[PDB]
């Protein structure tokens, strides 16, 4: 009865938009992005992947309260490299691994009987 609605874990309320990007005031060349209506499914996946890129000085994420779906991702990169480009590559990399994982599974599946 004081419970929030269940769809507020995935549906973006009005105004609220998926990403908000903020310039970090601590270290130079670092940024902090808030992700509305996401979680460890995505935060932990982007972060671990954003860490394979050797021009990424820093990358971490965190759900500040488990009541809400928003999580924060902080990225820092080498001079010359934009933090948003590092994210972009991070995503693409994932997406290609997944279209790979998918074709590989389908092929396997069809070779099975029963």
């Amino acid at each position: 009865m004081n419970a929030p609605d269940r769809f507020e874990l995935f549906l973006l309320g009005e105004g609220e938009s998926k990403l908000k990007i903020d310039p970090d005031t601590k270290a130079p060349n670092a940024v902090v992005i808030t992700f509305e209506k996401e979680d460890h499914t995505l935060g932990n996946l982007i972060r671990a992947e954003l860490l394979n890129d050797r021009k990424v000085l820093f990358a971490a994420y965190k759900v500040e309260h488990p009541f809400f779906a928003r999580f924060k991702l902080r990225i820092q990169t080498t001079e010359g490299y934009d933090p948003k480009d590092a994210l972009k590559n991070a995503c693409n990399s994932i997406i290609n691994k997944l279209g790979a994982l998918k074709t590989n599974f389908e092929t396997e599946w069809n070779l099975q009987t029963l």
Partner: protein
């Protein structure tokens, strides 16, 4: 083929068992979380009761009907009511079910999901067909009736995801295990005498090399190669659960790529 590597060891209409190698731990898990909670399915989400002189409470029954698995094959061509421009719902987005039974005999009268009747135009697609894996043809006993008792209701099955209500999950249980011999020192065995004799070796010990005491601890070695088994509840055939899994996860990565562009 280029990337992450999959190998089936068993398949049925209900389970797929596979090794999954050349992948990041964070991906394997992320995939399971999505596979559990985020792949769209059809289930009942409105019941309108005309008569319920049963032994059970209205919303008690309504609850049971939620959890009844329904064919979700062609789900991708059905809309969310929140989206669809209809007022309330139509055959473009929702599927209407009926249920009637009256107490006929002296003996107790049973009410099974096989008794649900689709009434919406299906527009020829594989949607809403209360999944029966039962051997005698009637799956999921909804409720029981005496002699003169009656139940007459109307259901509306809609597209949804586990995150909303757990009824909407095609998941069941997902077995997930890496590094069966603990070569990675990801765990620390609790014991009284001797670890190995005290803890049972997992079935997946045959698929990896023995640790060998004569070797120092490998500190570069990483979480890679994952033994999984995905079980399907019924609404989507197993393979598809993993596939729309891999897919919905790909789709939601992209929604971000996209979001970077607009702003």
């Amino acid at each position: 083929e280029e990337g992450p590597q999959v190998k089936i060891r068993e398949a049925s209409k209900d389970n797929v068992d596979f090794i999954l190698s050349n992948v990041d731990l964070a991906m394997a898990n992320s995939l399971r979380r999505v596979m559990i909670a985020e792949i769209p399915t059809l289930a009942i989400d409105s019941v309108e009761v005309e008569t319920n002189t049963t032994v059970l409470a209205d919303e008690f029954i309504a609850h049971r009907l939620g959890l009844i698995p329904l064919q979700s094959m062609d789900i991708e061509q059905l809309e969310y009511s929140r989206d669809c421009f209809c007022e309330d719902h139509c055959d473009k987005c929702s599927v209407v079910l009926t249920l009637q039974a009256f107490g006929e005999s002296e003996s107790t009268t049973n009410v099974y999901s096989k008794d649900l009747v689709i009434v919406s135009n299906l527009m020829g697609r594989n949607i809403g067909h209360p999944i029966i894996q039962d051997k005698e043809g009637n799956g999921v006993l909804i409720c029981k009736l005496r002699k003169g008792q009656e139940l007459k209701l109307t259901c509306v099955a809609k597209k949804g995801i586990a995150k909303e209500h757990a009824k909407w999950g095609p998941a069941a249980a997902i077995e997930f295990e890496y590094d069966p011999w603990n070569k990675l020192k990801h765990t620390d065995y609790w014991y009284e005498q001797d670890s190995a004799k005290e803890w049972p070796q997992s079935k997946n010990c045959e698929y990896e090399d023995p640790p060998n005491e004569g070797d120092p601890f490998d500190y570069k070695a990483q979480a890679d190669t994952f033994y999984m088994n995905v079980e399907s509840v019924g609404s989507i055939p197993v393979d598809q659960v993993v596939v729309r899994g891999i897919d919905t996860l790909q789709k939601k990565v992209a929604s971000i790529l996209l979001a970077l562009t607009q702003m």
